[PDB]
Amino acid sequence: MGSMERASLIQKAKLAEQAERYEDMAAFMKGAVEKGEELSCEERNLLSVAYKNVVGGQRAAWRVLSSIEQKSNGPEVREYREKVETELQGVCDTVLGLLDSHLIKEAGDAESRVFYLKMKGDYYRYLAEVATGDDKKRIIDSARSAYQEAMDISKKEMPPTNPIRLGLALNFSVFHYEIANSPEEAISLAKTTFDEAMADLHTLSEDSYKDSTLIMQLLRDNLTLWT
């Protein structure tokens, strides 16, 4: 990747996206990140979409395999679940590595800092879904810490209906419910987020309306599911 010009890497990521070749898309965006320039909002979208498609496929496969393994309770299903698990962990480690080495900085606008900290929380959460024992505790603490820092910035620097702030709060509420065994906190965070977002929706730009209303619908649907 390093031999290609930054603009060429970005163009190839967009081509890979059109071709539904998400592993390639992710590798192109990793190369682009490694050039050492900040990412624009469009480029953060490319980065996010690419890696989430890859890890999404892995998570779906791991869930199928883990279900079969539990129902079974020969060696094959355990071996193959371990293989997929190790690949998932590899991808999460690559993303977390990029975030730590290049993307997360004290400098830069609030949107970008919150986006990257949310991403760190998400990828630790995906590691937590497959972890056991003492490692699991450390991983959960890492996710919680990243999400909390992002929440603190978003509350200080972004309006309550901002779609990045909303997506962060949605994902943190999922962390509480599905990872941290904290249903009360999940529900409380989702309800407070929903209400404060609706109270300020009249101030939101038209460019953000579809996105923010999508996230608020998801908060509502989770609230219905959890109650």
């Binding site: 979409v49 999922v174 999940a186 959890w226």
Partner: peptide, 11 residues
């Protein structure tokens, strides 16, 4: 039914 997180769409 698992909780729904932020969807993988361009914002």
């Amino acid at each position: 039914q698992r909780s729904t997180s932020t969807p993988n769409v361009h914002m």
